[PDB]
Write a new protein. Sequence first.
Lengths: 152, 152, 150, 144, 143, 144
Amino acid sequence: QGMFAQLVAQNVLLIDGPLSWYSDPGLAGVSLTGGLSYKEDTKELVVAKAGVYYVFFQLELRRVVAGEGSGSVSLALHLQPLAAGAAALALTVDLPPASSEARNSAFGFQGRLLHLSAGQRLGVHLHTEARARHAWQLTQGATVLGLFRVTP
Amino acid sequence: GMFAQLVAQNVLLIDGPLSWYSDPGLAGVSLTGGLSYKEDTKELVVAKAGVYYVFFQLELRRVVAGEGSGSVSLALHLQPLRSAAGAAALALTVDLPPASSEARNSAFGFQGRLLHLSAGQRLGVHLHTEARARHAWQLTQGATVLGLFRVT
Amino acid sequence: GMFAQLVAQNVLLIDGPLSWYSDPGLAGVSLTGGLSYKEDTKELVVAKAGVYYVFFQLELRRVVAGEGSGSVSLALHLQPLRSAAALALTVDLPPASSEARNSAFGFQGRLLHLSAGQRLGVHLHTEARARHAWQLTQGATVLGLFRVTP
Amino acid sequence: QDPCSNCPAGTFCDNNRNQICSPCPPNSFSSAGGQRTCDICRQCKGVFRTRKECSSTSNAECDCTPGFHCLGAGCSMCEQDCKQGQELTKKGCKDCCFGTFNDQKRGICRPWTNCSLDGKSVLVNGTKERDVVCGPSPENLYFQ
Amino acid sequence: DPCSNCPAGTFCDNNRNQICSPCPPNSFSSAGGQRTCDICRQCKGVFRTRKECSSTSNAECDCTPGFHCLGAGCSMCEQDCKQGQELTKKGCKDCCFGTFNDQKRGICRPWTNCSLDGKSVLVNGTKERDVVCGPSPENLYFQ
Amino acid sequence: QDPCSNCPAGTFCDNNRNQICSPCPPNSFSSAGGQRTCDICRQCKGVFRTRKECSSTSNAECDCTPGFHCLGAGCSMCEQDCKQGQELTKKGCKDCCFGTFNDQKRGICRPWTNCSLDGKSVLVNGTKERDVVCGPSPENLYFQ
Ligand SMILES: *[C@@H]1O[C@H](CO[C@@H]2O[C@@H](C)[C@@H](O)[C@@H](O)[C@@H]2O)[C@@H](O[C@@H]2O[C@H](CO)[C@@H](O)[C@H](O)[C@H]2NC(C)=O)[C@H](O[C@@H]2O[C@@H](C)[C@@H](O)[C@@H](O)[C@@H]2O)[C@H]1NC(C)=O
Ligand SMILES: *[C@@H]1O[C@H](CO[C@@H]2O[C@@H](C)[C@@H](O)[C@@H](O)[C@@H]2O)[C@@H](O[C@@H]2O[C@H](CO)[C@@H](O)[C@H](O)[C@H]2NC(C)=O)[C@H](O[C@@H]2O[C@@H](C)[C@@H](O)[C@@H](O)[C@@H]2O)[C@H]1NC(C)=O
Ligand SMILES: *[C@@H]1O[C@H](CO[C@@H]2O[C@@H](C)[C@@H](O)[C@@H](O)[C@@H]2O)[C@@H](O[C@@H]2O[C@H](CO)[C@@H](O)[C@H](O)[C@H]2NC(C)=O)[C@H](O[C@@H]2O[C@@H](C)[C@@H](O)[C@@H](O)[C@@H]2O)[C@H]1NC(C)=O
């Protein structure tokens, strides 16, 4: 069983801060094989074996209050320990203002190759620049952090 | 190596299952042993169980100047599996911008994630349109793609 | 293993081939043996044949407040050019509004069969008004690939 | 044969442990037997309230916080109770069609009074928000 | 080099030990040396097949009656230009000011200039209609 | 004597060459020692100008070309200098709020002249672009 993982976000409400993740592999859409594990206190995924990984996350939102809510939402992947500059993965999804043509969901996907060593911690932070934030929520099961090792 | 990539034959925006090219002699199409396309049921059949990085992408173009608006979605259906886990294992919506002075004449979306596929599982893609003047938009030929490779 | 990730050097929206950072001593850039970067032709050269997952992403930021609109497209080209683009992405630049959407992003990946000696170029095309108002986000326009079989 | 077929609802057939069936993890459920995973429970937060809580065999169900109503099967999204001049349809709050009115929150559109049927004039025309105001007979001294 | 001048209509088959295999159906290879054939273009909906695909050349589309091609390779269709409009290389554009077109699928023509034989403009023109000339400005019609 | 702690700012601990220190590649920097890679230097082009060039140790700083000014931290965006009727605020150029004015490029909003304070009338009301024009005392022969 090669080194790979996929976590489904627990959060529904748009609040700035670290996302909490489902990590039990018995849950549909969640896989945590090898020596990989999840630190629930710090909300970080800890890497099992060193290598280069294809790391990706997915961001899907649904309008939960009809006719309300607009702005944008952002995810950032943070590595622990850190170089000094930048974030490893950044994805911004715009929420369309409510209109007759506007749909009530929004989606964004981004993927990257990342150097990860064993014992490295990966956290994701949610940021929101939205008006009437209550009108949008994270689509349950569709905000996902995944990674698999490409150096076999 | 265990991977497949199919290119959709479909051109017209009609609700229903997409049909796929499966001959590796064609550009964009490759398959290994253990992955095969059943033409009569429009499904990609997986032979070996495992975890796969599965992705699809959807590109549309405006074919009638000045017309067309709405949205188009793709859903990956897994069979056999309970509806909760396999109905929308992969789902993506793209919006058709109304015809305007901006003259935005194409739309694009991409999604991927890790799925556990069982031996004998069959992958099908359903196209759904909620659009006005559907005749004015078409799938860009060669740019509607379903791909996957086993991570293990 | 066999993989590479290049980070674009360009920031200004100009029609033509993108130039790439390729030294793996930089954050975000990696290049194993069997893949190399030809600087004069701005081409990534594959040395060993196989099927790779190739992906690139395009991120743009508005650098002039209240200005800039249109679209920007990336295209991955194989030379041996034969007689189409292997990957093709078009990102739309929102007009300036009070809603203030000042970034634009696109991502595409797929499986590509590459033969020994295959060279990869990425070309940038702009169809924008006031293109000075938009720029490539530095470190966020990326082309990557890794081998899948063998 | 296949031992997963005997894992009941509330468990899943665990490919990660030595045991064959494991109870659903917290915040999850399996409504049928023989599942290889359990499904993450629906959470009802913000505008949503928890009408029925999640169990190991049954998904939670949401409704909308007071002053809002559900829209869509399974209460997919919430919508403010319709105001004066609209009525609730399956696709949300909709203006009263021409000739009908509704004067109160959470009402139904109903046609205007036809004063002409009772032989009365129209002093003030109605709108989607108000009924007509009929006057005296046209003949009545009020009309010269 | 391998695959060197695999003739048009064939592709260098990595699966048949690099024999030049014939292109699969609905594909073509207009050049030598290709390792795959390209999928034939389909002309459906508003498009019609002008030229059919062959093993050596792609199909070519045109537009269904009532529309005309717009792009370089007929990349989209546009409804036939109406009165007040002229078909350009970039689609139906309105007649330049001072000119008109009073018929569907027509070319813009400049307005009649009444002043040339000393006449007057009674009704001005638009993009859709020519001016109407009247009597001389000094005619007692105008007083 | 941890090997990577031997590499100071301006180099990185090359994990491709067995923990030797390598100088930062061209157009990069490392602001602390012991980093395993250097980060690409900020470029300042187009509407941007280089305020401080980057070194092996420090990142480059951008400012805006004349006629424009920086918006946001680190000069992440440029904005044309504010014209008459506006004032430069942290969020950009903003109209003078009601009762104030600025009559020049790159100015600040000042309050209108209170004509009543000096016992004078108002001949022309001000705007965000112009001060009011006061007149003679209302009891003057100017006024009937
Ligand atoms: C009362 O209002 C009617 C208007 O109907 C619609 O609803 C209103 C809330 C408003 O939005 C209005 O714009 C709408 O048209 C009138 O009947 C309508 O009259 C218009 C104008 O001729 C006509 O286009 C509509 O078809 C017609 N409705 C129907 C169902 O046929 C009432 O009477 C009109 O006014 C008279 C002067 C005369 O034109 C008569 O034929 C009209 O019916 C309005 N009544 C009064 C007393 O104002
Ligand atoms: C007859 O229509 C001519 C067409 O030009 C119009 O320009 C716009 C103003 C608009 O009305 C549009 O629909 C037309 O395409 C007029 O000529 C224009 O006149 C305007 C004056 O407002 C002038 O600015 C334009 O440059 C001029 N266009 C051209 C191509 O010359 C005629 O106006 C007559 O000419 C003027 C010089 C002036 O003498 C005016 O009093 C005249 O009526 C229109 N003439 C008549 C008799 O209707
Ligand atoms: C001069 O203008 C003042 C502010 O005008 C506002 O901004 C302008 C750009 C314009 O759009 C105007 O309509 C705006 O209201 C006036 O004071 C304001 O007047 C409005 C009138 O409804 C009132 O609601 C505001 O509270 C008031 N603001 C303050 C701080 O007092 C000046 O006086 C007004 O106009 C006079 C004719 C008189 O009626 C006075 O009572 C009004 O307040 C303007 N002075 C003039 C015109 O001499």
